[PDB]
Symmetry: C5
Subunit: 307 residues, 5 copies
């Protein structure tokens, strides 16, 4: 095979779309292999700029195509340089821009700890014809800085693995596995905006929903609970545009569920308190000891749910 | 005709847009036919990368164009390889990315069970000049995994059928039918998010709407019903952006209809209870036996509507 | 002139955007004219696939360009075949995809009855150099089926007319008129979703707004009317994203107007009832005979407005 | 210089985006200059269709590039004809489609009276090498018709002016000014939809906010004012998506401001009426003469604000 | 190296997207270097228009590619002129259009004072082979005018710095640093729209929330506070689409936080006032001296928070 050395530079990571679970990564790729010795004008290496490499490719120069596996849509490439040394090595430098995708598990939404994965693999040549020697990822632009609400932490993990493509074994009998480079960049979500915009207001809504039992008569406490459940419905919409549709529940969706449960349990308890009287003579105070028991049970529920 | 063998590899299915009834499928296509024996440099097969196939096509090589019938917009193709063996066969490998469309029947919205259809057909050569022998679809990347809220179940159904184009019979007298490959991938929607975000909150709203009859006087129960119907209007908006405009009613839209019906039937019954008095002396308890009859009728309605 | 025969095939009509008054039409166009006899390899006709027609065009073959007049944006063309018979005729087959536009009058919104218009006209050759003989439109894919909320009814109307371009008369003295093909496909909007999502809920809101006069005192009936007008404001937003900005009023906007009018007329009547007392001794029942007169006038208004 | 005559045809103006202050204009451009006499096949003029003009341009034909100065993004050109007469003149006909921009002053929003400006200027040749003789704009398609909510009024104003580019004076010593064509199309916004959707409902909200002073006690009138200010907040959102962010106030934003001012002045006046009692014995009627004075002052404010 | 002189002209800055922290800059770039003397037809300089420069580039002319570092997506270039003087200098004039990005710090949101940064750097040639001599930025189109809600103030700051690329040092031993031009355009946000749309309405909401303590009994003041907190929730949504997700709090988000704090502190104080009675005989006036103390503390909080 041909020993190909890659040096991926990351310019910036931007536009991390949580709803679509995609992100956009800019930067440069510098692939370098070796070939036969060639003659250049002077001792200096030749610079082959874009839209003119095609004359060299139609001349017979071996320029492989390196594609991104996990990309979404066509990667919007820009300028490209094919720098030709006369000692033998050929260097293909290109700028890439594309939307990449990952799994992006969302069990803990505001306190999330994710990673951004770049995958590179030759489109046509397998590991018997093109082998990746090593990659050095230069993430010095975003090594210790925060993009949007994501704090990039650590360096970039590099890994070279041989992926196997069973769909291509009908045209290649034995050699049908490809050398893939994986680049992993960790990212920790900053939870401050969610903490002061969704979590603590909903805690205040929960305390206000607890405040129904301090009232004195029945219609006023029903209207109190109903106008509280209306503003609980108000926060049901706000979370519909910050995280996608998930089979599980996150922290904020569990808080919405707890708000609905607290308010409707209060309404049912108030109804059962009102219809407690068989002949309309009994006072209703024995079941209304939930001024100091219902918040305690709610705190126990929250403490269990945190762990 | 020419016997063409296709091997479609599916990389990932993403972005299933329910409102537009489209979805995006990435992957590779490997078409393979046979031709005259040719000579290559060495015994090894020749690899013809992208943007250089045109020299071979202008030289006179037969490379058919395979289009997607059910695609929406232009399929955003990427890299392509035209691998030439010297024993005779020509292999056209290409990467595709495009938005596909299907019927996507939506009778049961959250408990839906749909399929994703890929259709492939030659654009110009009919079955008398190009015949699809067989297709093996390698859906091993998403064989037993869940994309977004869709759990992909089973393998990919393959079928080769001869479709007939009557619009082209004016230029082709007898042979005007084309061989189309259909690839069917089943998908079952995960109903959990809808279950805890729309169905059970609306059930709590229904019980709260039932709670009007436990009040004691008239103006308070009217205001109770009105502030309940306001939060029923609140959920009328939330469902407007999760499923498209349909002639029929789904489960959630039927629940909205049942909420409106319950609240307005309660308001009309309360009004008729108030105006039951001919001279203002009669008590109103005979018509207010719906504390234990109106929910029973609603449960009967729901049980009939489920089946 | 040259007699050109067109056979437009319609694959699917999708994405009818009411707010933008555009729609997207896929399918194929098959133009066919006649020319000098030519020699082909063998007796079989020659197939000229895409991205290779340019060699024949630079060789000197007459391939006219047929553009779409009413299209929005560039029509996203795909594959194209230039099928050359040796008996003389040249057949240009191409696939088109583009957003088309029409007037789309919206007097009756949910019970609308619209049409989809495709217009085709040569870009450069007038009727003295290129004449459309006839068109057969093969709308067999959507002849008797419903797209989105639009039921396609009937076949496709064909018409050939000579349009006149006065802007081009400075460069062409007498012959400056072009032969345009118009294809009309009727479509009837399915009114069910609007009927059970906007019309009947707003009727229930109207009846609830009528229900104010059954109350007994003043502050409660004002708060009743105010919390009803709030949920009338709630439906003012929902209709803002289903139909564009229009100088006139549709059915649903007239229902919103009637809701505002009913509620504010009720508020003004209640205020005038309260201030009817010169010295605070008069009872207010003479002006509150609108329990059986205000709905009757509203029904008369609606019956007049329907016709 | 070379005398160039332009004849701009306007097909349709669509998609006037008020928030972005852009609009889309379709149509054709017909540029015509004169040159050396040439020989054509026969006496007829030659038609040079698109994607084949490049052979004539590489042959040495002078085809200038005319760009649009005020365009947003790349103007999506379509088909183009380079019609060559043998008597000497060369005619460049092209179809354009692009998003144009203007200042679009918005002092009176619903009763606006705007214009749509098209600017054309050669990219490379100044007025010493290419001079625009005259332009005739053929706006006969939209001369007396209304697009969206904009009624196009009058014809199209034509003007040829020499614009000066000081950035290019380092490479051109004296001749660095360019001949620009400006095309002005007036448009009057139809105010009906805003009149019956925002202006008159907000007037009803204003009258309902005036209705607080007719109540009898304090808590009910506070809750009345609060539930009115809630639906004033409801219309604060609806206007956020119909006009962009502006330093000044339009008519509708002034109505929102007047609604907030009326309601909060009523609340402050009610509070000062309640705390008017030094010992709780005084009646509060002297300050509540605003049943017939507060609307009069509001009418004076509105009459001053209109002029 | 080669001395390259740049003269950037700015046509217009538009579409400053605060949520994405990007902006769009149109205009022209005029690069100019020197080379060997050449012969042109006549004494006049040669004009090389677009899509024909490639013949000169394949002939062997040195045209460097200048890229934008901070751009988002591919910069949508338009027309380009390569003006060749016979005295030796080569002038590359091109039009650019692209979305640029900056840090855009948002500590004070409505009273913001930002800058727009354009960065230009050769893609392939380092400072040993191409050196930027000087840049004159001609921002005369927007020198003293306001774009959208941004008032452009001052001229454009020019700076030439040598940036160092450590990722490219594996292919270049010592010379691996590039000359970058930075263009800084200051912009001050106009705070008027935010001042009369968010700041002063929320101040009125704060005063209305203070108004709870003037009521007389308990259930009415709870419902007062609850229906005030509902319209505080109403403004929590409106600010979600004008500024992005930030770790810190701006002015308006601090006002929302202060509104929630004031209302829930009032609710807690009212609850503690109600449960102040050990046996139900004590009057509650000592803790309700916050009619003249709670606003004073709130004013102290606001005065501290401003500085
Ligand atoms: Na309320
Ligand atoms: Na509300
Ligand atoms: Na919304």
């Amino acid at each position: 095979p041909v020993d190909v050395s890659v040096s991926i530079f990351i310019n910036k990571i931007y536009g991390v779309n949580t709803l679509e679970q995609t992100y956009k990564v800019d930067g440069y790729i510098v692939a370098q292999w070796t070939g036969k010795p060639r003659k250049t004008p002077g001792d200096k290496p030749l610079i082959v700029e874009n839209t003119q490499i095609e004359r060299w490719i139609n001349n017979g120069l071996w320029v492989p195509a390196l594609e991104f596996i996990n990309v979404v849509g066509s990667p919007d490439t820009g300028n490209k340089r094919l720098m030709l040394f006369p000692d033998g090595r050929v260097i293909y430098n290109a700028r890439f821009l594309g939307s990449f995708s990952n799994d992006m598990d969302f069990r803990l939404f505001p306190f999330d700890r994710q990673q951004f994965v770049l995958e590179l693999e030759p489109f046509s040549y397998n590991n018997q014809q093109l082998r990746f020697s090593d990659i050095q990822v230069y993430t010095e632009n975003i090594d210790n800085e925060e993009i949007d609400e994501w704090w990039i932490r650590g360096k970039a993990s590099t890994h070279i693995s041989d992926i196997r493509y069973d769909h291509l074994s009908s045209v290649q009998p034995n050699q049908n596995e490809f050398s893939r480079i994986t680049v992993r960049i960790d990212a920790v979500r900053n939870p401050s905006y969610y903490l002061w915009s969704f979590i603590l207001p909903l805690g205040l809504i929960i305390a206000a929903s607890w405040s129904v039992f301090w009232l004195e008569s029945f219609s006023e406490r029903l209207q109190t609970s109903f106008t509280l459940m209306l503003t609980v419905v108000a926060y049901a919409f706000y979370t519909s545009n910050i995280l996608p549709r998930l089979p599980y529940t996150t922290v904020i969706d569990q808080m919405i569920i707890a708000g609905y449960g607290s308010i409707f349990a209060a309404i049912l308890l108030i109804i059962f308190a009102h219809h407690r009287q068989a002949n309309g003579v009994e006072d209703d105070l024995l079941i209304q000891r939930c001024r100091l028991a219902f918040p305690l049970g709610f705190l126990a529920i929250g403490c269990v749910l945190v762990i």
